Design a protein around this ligand. Structure first.
Ligand SMILES: *Cc1c(COP(=O)(O)O)cnc(C)c1O
Ligand SMILES: *Cc1c(COP(=O)(O)O)cnc(C)c1O
Ligand SMILES: [Cl-]
Ligand SMILES: [Cl-]
Ligand code: NA
Ligand code: NA
Lengths: 381, 374
């Protein structure tokens, strides 16, 4: 009846580019289709069934048996905040490992919530070393938890989580993991690696629209949380666990479309053969992108052996800014990602998450080569 | 596979989420892109601007937040009330109780002014409560209590609060878009809503409006966090025309479509009159069946009605009975979930759909009475 109301907004949001973004990312058509289904009550038997099926699929995917998996109505950073209000004493110290922009965000989340942050920082492109963590924990024995950015989206680096988590546990510390750009793209074995908190978002490796956060919490974390004073209501983890058990839903209204979308995404992974084959696909995309930029004669930021399977930070040739590549590719129909953080000018990024065909990547790379050559000639280099 | 579990199977008269317009559902499936792109910044600001217009906000700030409405309920407390500070929480239903829970769980103290389900807060009672509670920093008001179908006299209540120089926090989750709101004019300091009620958009997004006074306090408020740091959201809106973290883009697009629909129908005035017309139709419809509502005279909600079931009949029975007829109403909520069931009148629903729902409700009531020997 109000076609024009729809058409007016469509003109602003209609598909314009082939997406190689850092999040949100291109969603699979099956996911987009479920996003338009009519709503109904989140307290209904119909919804409770879907909410729980999604949680079950995530417990399987994340290999969680002893801990709890929750769906939260917020972006991933919501659980980042939750980890601090629930698992660290007021004024308590947190050893925040920083290898990029999001490690810095965790620090801000720690401090803004009344906790203290002890930093172990590296230059963009480097990954945290287990030996340095052990060293840091040695001289900072009063810290209660350690945060690890599994996949640093600003640098295209994947931290060696298993080994880092091992070291943290040897010091009997809580392990908090920001896996926003890692979950669904890099493996996570929650119980086995001894993680206490891991969180992610719907709009990265899972290829679902933004609006939902996914969290997994250990028994150890939950025991501390239920006794943690003034942790609030919106991110009261024990409250969420109680609602999941009793009402098979969330305390407040959940982002239903995104939940349906994640369920579809999990079924897609199952259809293709399971988690292993899905992660294999991600590694093949990453490889193709890295090898492709290498052919063009460009270097990447990530140190060898720690390259991200979800995104690559490419260093621009001398005299060219990341923004210039971003804008030039857009004019050719390709949306990459601007550099982020302290390397925003010396790099641009290429995401390889969500709906992405190998042929589209190849086409993107051929256009990038021309963009690079043209910018060089343009500037006389 | 998933479509089977979520496919449409009921005519919706829910308490939230609600039935969304076809236009809104269609925009919900558009492909995503960066929330840091020029394309998204344009849509984010257009939506915020249409909301500032709708809410009549000029001096304050309007924000879109990645959370359900309760998220801003929490934000109001962490940003506008000193730690250990006192808040006068007015309660007339289940959600007033939630605000109380949010106040206490965040380390603040709640002073309660509570009424039995069906009643509305009286400006005179609020005035007396405030005189006896001088240390109170803010007053919370549930504009539209969804569990009882009651609309509080916000303008008059906000008036009293300001007379005592208190901050005015308003839970308008089931009110915004269904009952008028004049932010600047009424002196409100915080008002928040969700996408899944009167606006008829899927859940996942929260809307908030904040006054200069509130922001001044928030900026100096220690340890208010990051996710609900209002001044941070204002800064990102101003500089990045987006949110600090990733926003629920589909729902933002949906709210924009919804606001354009309101415009195309004649504007806010005509939209609100449409809501009152719908509510009046439901109230007379149930009263014609021989039923009464819970809301006290003059405080009937334009978005939802709490209907008292006949003696011997539970609200749940009517809910399940209607479901078998293809109609989805709402179970009673709170301490009256047995004596009442609810009929929401939000989102997409033609007057004819309401009539068809009312006719089936009549047969359902008689069928229930008959099987119960009534
Ligand atoms: C994208 C991202 C975040 C923020 O996720 P949101 O959903 O916007 O809150 C945090 N950490 C990392 C590593 C990310 O890539
Ligand atoms: C539905 C409702 C809420 C909660 O809204 P959410 O989006 O689920 O957080 C709060 N208050 C009232 C009056 C409501 O109707
Ligand atoms: Cl609810
Ligand atoms: Cl961001
Ligand atoms: Na602009
Ligand atoms: Na602006």
């Amino acid at each position: 009846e109000f076609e024009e109301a729809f058409k007016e907004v469509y003109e602003m949001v209609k598909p314009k580019y082939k997406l190689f973004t850092a999040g949100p990312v291109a969603c699979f058509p099956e996911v987009l289709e479920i996003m338009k289904v009519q709503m109904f009550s989140h307290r209904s038997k119909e919804y409770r069934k879907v909410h729980m099926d999604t949680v079950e699929r995530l417990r399987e995917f994340l290999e969680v048996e002893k801990g709890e998996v929750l769906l939260v109505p917020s972006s991933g950073t919501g659980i980042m905040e939750a980890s601090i209000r629930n698992g660290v004493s007021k004024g308590g110290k947190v050893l925040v490992t920083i290898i990029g922009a999001f490690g810095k965000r965790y620090k801000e989340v720690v401090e803004s919530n009344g906790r203290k942050a002890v930093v172990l920082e590296y230059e963009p492109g480097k990954a945290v070393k287990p030996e340095d963590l052990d060293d840091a924990l040695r001289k900072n024995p009063d810290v209660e938890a350690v945060t690890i950015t599994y996949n640093e989206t600003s640098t295209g680096v994947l931290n060696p989580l298993p080994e880092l988590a091992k070291v943290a546990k040897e010091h009997d510390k809580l392990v908090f993991v920001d896996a926003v750009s890692a979950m669904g793209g890099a493996d996570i074995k929650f119980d086995k690696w001894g993680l206490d908190v891991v969180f992610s978002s719907s709009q990265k490796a899972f290829g679902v629209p933004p609006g939902l956060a996914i969290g997994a919490f250990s028994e150890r974390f939950l025991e501390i949380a239920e006794k943690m004073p003034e942790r609030g209501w919106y991110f009261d983890i024990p409250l969420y666990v109680k609602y999941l058990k009793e009402k098979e839903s969330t305390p407040s209204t959940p982002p239903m479309p995104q939940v349906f979308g994640i369920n579809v995404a999990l079924r897609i992974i199952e259809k293709m053969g399971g988690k292993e084959k899905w992660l294999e696909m991600y590694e093949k995309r990453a490889k193709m992108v890295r090898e492709g930029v290498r052919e063009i004669g460009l270097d990447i930021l990530a140190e060898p052996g720690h390259e991200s399977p979800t995104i690559t930070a490419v260093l621009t040739p001398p005299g060219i800014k990341g923004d210039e590549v971003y804008e030039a590719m857009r004019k050719r129909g390709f949306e990459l990602a601007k550099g982020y953080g302290s390397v925003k000018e010396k790099t641009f990024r290429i995401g390889h998450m969500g709906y992405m065909k190998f042929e589209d990547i190849q086409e993107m790379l051929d256009n990038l080569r021309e963009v690079i050559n043209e910018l060089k000639k343009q500037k006389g280099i």
